[PDB]
């Protein structure tokens, strides 16, 4: 009676038709995931937003529950495993340092990196793999700039970081070795910065105070690694997916070449439209019985609040399946909602905007080097995107 879940096919960005049918007939429904417990699935924009904003729906039980999921291992902890007040405290300290102004201050460096990456692509000649040469490189290098990793260390830092991607084909031990290198490295960088602060985010996080409170040694380190993993694969996959869409929908590419000022609005529209998740990770747990759409979610039950379906809800977004780069209003949930609302979203916006800006400026004829039906899609089962994007220009 619960439906097998996920509904999305990983081999593309299509939004499963089941979502729409549930938004109509059964907006709070039961699902059976590949691993973990059966759960409620919530699919209407209004309800998804209500769930993510509601104090009765928490993340703490993640730590001691068999979470609905698509992979056998569970990845636990981070800010997203915490609830107020402990969550509020850490978030207050982080946002104090990681401000929208810091995010925008990185646009010039983000563009310089994007141009170097395009130089490297042009230097090896068509076809180049946009995924390996650009999408997997820009967001970790920008995180390097953000944190304060000295330039000479960007290559080894990038190399360790690649082992954390869900698409990586490394043994357990290899990934383990990259994880120890990155922790050790970040720990030392934090300690330098503490005694000799610069202008980078690690310096500002060490000096962040909130009515006499500060981040502990371990907190600093877990938060810095936490930003790395939250900010790398997401951004990488979304760059790949946006460019795949640009290269396969000529009217989208023509609109942005003609009017590059539309790039920020287009980033928002594609963040809405792309159901980036294979499913919905990060189940919330009811702290008490909650009745939603006349159905009672009981205390302790997991609830998957689908931002992919919510962002494509016809009740909230006129002609929701149309990509309209000027769409307004566009109050999408592509960066989340409520206390866990993506804290890197200003910088993600900067990076996505820069990626499209530089690629379009440098390679206005960029297009697929192989037929669309021949693309290989990631089977990492967390996010959807192409494994390789051979491009010509
Ligand atoms: C797709 C995005 C996520 O990717 C992930 O969740 C990454 C998952 C990969 C697939 C895992 O690696 C796999 O583990 C298996 C046991 C073996 C398998 N191989 C080697 C055959 C291997 O590929 C995990 C265990 C990798 C380790 C290094 C890890 O902790 C990765 C963390 C990355 C988390 C990524 C970011 O999500 C963040 O997860 C945190 C737990 C949350 O608190 C939150 O913010 C910090 C969230 O981002 C919003
Ligand atoms: C296109 C790129 C990105 C997308 C689509 C994205 C999306 C999201 C979403 C939907 C959430 C909320 C998850 C939930 O509530 O279940 C989230 C949380 C988070 N994101 Fe992002 N994100 C992106 C980039 C980034 C970047 C670049 C960073 C950091 C530099 C970042 C750091 C974080 C952190 C630390 C959280 C958890 C916040 C908390 O629990 O308080 N994200 N992101």
From Swiss-Prot:
Family per record: Belongs to the cytochrome P450 family.
Alphabetical list of InterPro entries matching this protein: Cyt_P450, Cyt_P450_B, Cyt_P450_CS, Cyt_P450_sf
UniProt-listed GO biological process terms: antibiotic biosynthetic process
Amino acid composition bias (Basic and acidic residues), ranges on this chain: 64-74
SUPFAM superfamilies in the record: Cytochrome P450
Pfam families, per the entry: p450 (PF00067)
Chain spans, region Disordered: 59-82
Molecular function via GO: heme binding; iron ion binding; monooxygenase activity; oxidoreductase activity, acting on paired donors, with incorporation or reduction of molecular oxygen
EC code: 1.14.-.-
EC primary class: oxidoreductase
Residues at which heme binds: 87, 91, 284, 340, 342
Recorded metabolic or biological pathway in which this protein acts: Antibiotic biosynthesis; mycinamicin biosynthesis
Binding site for substrate: 77
Keywords: Antibiotic biosynthesis, Heme, Iron, Metal-binding, Monooxygenase, NADP, Oxidoreductase
Disruption phenotype: Cells lacking this gene do not produce mycinamicin I, mycinamicin II and mycinamicin V, and accumulate mycinamicin IV.
CDD domains: Cyp158A-like (cd11031)
Annotated source species: Micromonospora griseorubida
The name this protein goes by in its record: Mycinamicin IV hydroxylase/epoxidase
Cofactor list: heme
Function (record text): Involved in the biosynthesis of mycinamicin, a 16-membered macrolide antibiotic. Catalyzes consecutive hydroxylation (at C14) and epoxidation (at C12-C13) reactions with mycinamicin IV as initial substrate, leading to mycinamicin II. These reactions require prior dimethylation of 6-deoxyallose to mycinose for effective conversion by the dual function MycG enzyme.
